[PDB]
Amino acid sequence: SGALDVLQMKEEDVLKFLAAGTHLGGTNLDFQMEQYIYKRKSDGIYIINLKRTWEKLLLAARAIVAIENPADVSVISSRNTGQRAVLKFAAATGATPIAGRFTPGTFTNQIQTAFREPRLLVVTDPRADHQPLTEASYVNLPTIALCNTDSPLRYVDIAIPCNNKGAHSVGLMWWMLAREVLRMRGTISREHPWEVMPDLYFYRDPEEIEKEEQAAA
Amino acid sequence: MRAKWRKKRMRRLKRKRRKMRQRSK
Amino acid sequence: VRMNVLADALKSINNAEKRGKRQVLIRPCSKVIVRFLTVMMKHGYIGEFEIIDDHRAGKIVVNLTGRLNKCGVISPRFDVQLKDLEKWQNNLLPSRQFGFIVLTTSAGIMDHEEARRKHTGGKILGFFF
Amino acid sequence: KGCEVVVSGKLRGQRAKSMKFVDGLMIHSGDPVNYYVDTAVRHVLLRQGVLGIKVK
Amino acid sequence: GKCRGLRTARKLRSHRRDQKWHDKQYKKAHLGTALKANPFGGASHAKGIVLEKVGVEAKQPNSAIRKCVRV
Amino acid sequence: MQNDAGEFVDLYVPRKCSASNRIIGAKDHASIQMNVAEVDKVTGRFNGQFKTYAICGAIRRMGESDDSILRLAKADGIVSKNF
Amino acid sequence: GRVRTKTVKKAARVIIEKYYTRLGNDFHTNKRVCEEIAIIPSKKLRNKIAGYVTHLMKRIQRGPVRGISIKLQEEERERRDNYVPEVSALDQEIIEVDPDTKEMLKLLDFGSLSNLQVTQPTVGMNFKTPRG
Amino acid sequence: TKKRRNNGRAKKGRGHVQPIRCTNCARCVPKDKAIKKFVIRNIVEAAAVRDISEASVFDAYVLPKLYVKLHYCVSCAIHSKVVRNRSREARKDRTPPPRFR
Amino acid sequence: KEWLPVTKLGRLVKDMKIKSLEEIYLFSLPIKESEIIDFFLGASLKDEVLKIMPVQKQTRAGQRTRFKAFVAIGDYNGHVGLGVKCSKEVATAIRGAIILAKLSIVPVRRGYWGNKIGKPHTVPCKVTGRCGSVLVRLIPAPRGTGIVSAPVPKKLLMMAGIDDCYTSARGCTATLGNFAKATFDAISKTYSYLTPDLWKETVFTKSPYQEFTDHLVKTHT
RNA sequence: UUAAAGUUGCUGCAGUUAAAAAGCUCGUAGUUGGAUCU
RNA sequence: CAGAUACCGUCGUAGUUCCGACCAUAAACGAUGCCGACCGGCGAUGCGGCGGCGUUAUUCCCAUGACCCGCCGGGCAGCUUCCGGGAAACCAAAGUCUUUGGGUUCCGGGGGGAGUAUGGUUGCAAAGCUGAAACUUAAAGGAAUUUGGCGAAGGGCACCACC
RNA sequence: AGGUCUCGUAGACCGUGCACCAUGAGCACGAAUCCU
């Protein structure tokens, strides 16, 4: 983030992190995540250090904004936890979304209809999206994966340690990554609260959709 | 023909010819 | 048990160079070993290196770079002459434009070109290219 | 759009083998077989025997 | 080799002699029985006298009467 | 590669990896052309210049590209010093 | 049974991909629509196409689809993606804060804020549910 | 070739185990190699338990079970369909099949 | 008749923007058309077939024979390639073999021996390749020696522009496909061996993706 | 008879399944033996 | 059973059991010598040591045993892979090998003849150790994919199969 | 004071067996040289 004091925790981002739950992870250790972590406690939940997560979120934002054209940034998700978040992320930034059932050979087979030659890949989860990571080897695609404590670190380039199992955590982090890249692009200022809604990027089940829309107007 | 009974037949032939040589003198 | 200490040290640093590790631990130490990496570091193949000086045989930690291909030994230490040096470097080196042979010499442990230009030779130690 | 050429009869030997040479798209059943493909069966006279032709 | 001492020459030489004795083409040329059993006795050509003309058959599928001479 | 004449003779020079300091071959398709955007020191917006790096495919396949990029950011000072 | 082949399914999927605004749940309207925008040389194939288009529009009106792509982005899910509660669902009056995370706040940048309360120790037991 | 990583047994650092005898056959199969069966069943099976219940001097008497351990040779274990053959990739499953019934 | 591309590299080489394919070899971009090679290399790219063999899978209707065709490709100023295509008809197998050899051409560098005078003639180091159970060595040679090897790597090293070398082969070299691929991945390794004159720190110029991206995204959709 | 034979391998062969590690241990020659002295 | 001095069943000698005197051969097999250095992750189990909330040998305090959370060292083992290797099955060793060299014992040069003959040696006997040649042949063998064929297993269909 | 507690489905093991191989002449069968 640099030594300049404009890109740190103001007062409330850490409060949103502790409310959503981006600080506690799984229950097994990983040898590539031995530094993005502090200590295992009782009940066996490892705690992720938060400043390192913030620094790699700045690093991923810098890597996204570094390329001039935003139309060739492929954002990828297949799990139902982050279908809406990547779609509205691509709507906010101008990225190209793939949401649910990523086709094999999208970057390799060139005569098929679903063909794309992008420049940057942004991946929700490395274990679930192991097929884009394999297809990112044959063509020169750098990638950013929101990793967990129980995610293998294979063919990855920027790892952001977080709990990618709760919908609030992934929705908030996709939203604030969009916030950071639109701040770095030169459209959003840091001085005022611009924010639309943190819940606007959240996936929610049809049962709770039905009961809350019946309870509310 | 496996090796066990081939070895047994060679052993029996060797025993017979050795007995014939030792009783021939 | 351990007999050729230089062979173990060069096998360890070759494995560390192959797997891309920046630093490696060498468990024993000797004057011949530290003179060998002095020759290597003067030639520019490696970088800085420390000596863990204690009351036993010391330990060496090195700062490797990517300019190293392979480290090897010649066991046992055969003796060579000035006539037979070209026979060794014709079949022990990948090219005649780089790569060096380190051999023990009464004028000091040194590379093959210095031994050629001061006209002396001795028992062989190993190679690096 | 497609073609099928087959030659049957005595071809280099006494056992009568048939050789088939196909390419392209070709249907085999339906009402449009009446008005998309054409049939022709001819008999060829040789010194050693007769050969059949079923071109389509 | 795998016995690689600086003062290992007689062991390597004896092992090489024994493993070279364990051969066929060298054992044919360096033994007296393999040349004693040769009909020519180590000669290129030889002369002989014909006593009977014998006709022999052939091997598997290729079958023809090949004609030889007993000398 | 030079010669005894004094002019360049090779057709092109290959790139160097920034972690293990090896080259990237012409048929190695797992190389990276990562660029990290450095920003203005009083506003924080993108200035225009980039900061490029390169990591070979074997380091990706072992899985240590992320800590490599972190060390290059530590050396370039883009990431914070204490971390 | 009435199990239809890939021709009618692919034709209905591509005609609902190209045309989503000018169709509907009425069979006798979109049947003549798929007559006037698509050249089908048969009639039973047209009937199966219109029935399958009606079935998939009922399916996409009820819930999400997993066979086609959307450009009008599904108004019935757009309203659920654009409705907002009054509360921001994260600014709680009190947070259940681990003392380990209290030390995480204590050592990083901050001290003790009023929004974070130290949890009483209810962690006297352990984990790793028995597997043998 | 070598079909399995082990040799159809559970011997790694022993070299000798005590032999046992089969139930159907009389083969001297080693103990760690044989298929061992432990089944539990009632003394009389469920075709007569109601008639046994309405023939007792007790009230709500519980029928006892029967315990026996069976040692099977592998030829007898396949001929009696206790264990079947598998594919190459399906052979790497040390877990038992699920017992829904 | 006129070519229309699929990928972005077709636009990049047809809009008079990629001056040479050395940039593509520098950035290691994959190639997926047998026509950028037609654009950059003219009539210097010869084609000679190595071997035709039959391969047979055999069913209840007897054996059906598809034909495997090895071919080696390369201009005589550097780049050399190889490609194996197997199909039923001979002519389309030969044409597909030409196409697949035309995609995968690798650039090579040549060194000296003893003194660095004149144009280079031999390989700069000792490089080998590994596939199957065959070994192909490439040992540098003094001038005027010529290529001493089997006829298939004689063809490969004469076509690649290597004037002279020394080779040595070990293993079952009767299988010509495995031996030819060993020679191909041995000669492709003449870059991947770091030499002391390549020790200085490289500089990364602008990638051709970043060079004309605004023109690229408006000249194709 | 030599090279091709890296099918006698000192440079420079192999020993799970193709030719092949003694059933295992102890044991005198022979071989090889840790660091350090301007 | 066409044919059983074979499979199957009823008896049954020598042996199977002990003490002493012998032989030294097994698919004695991890079909992989011994020592030493280096080279990924994870979860378990056996031993010894060490640290720490909590429960129990009933309620308070210490040490002991038990359970739980880790760490260290040796050992029998397990799961995954573009570290790497191999002809492939496969291997954390069968890796660190043309970019060959840590040290040291035994052992193999196509397949038969043949572990046979002779000579020696050991043994009460049976038999172990060393061990050829003449002659003959262009094959003998290792890994693995497709139809084939089962007196192997698992499914599906049929009023020219059944209920 | 009520008197048939509510909700959902595998809960299938429970009697099944075999004397055997001796049957035997056959197998191959294209590339032109292709621009295309």
Ligand SMILES: [Zn+2]
């Ligand atoms: Zn049995």
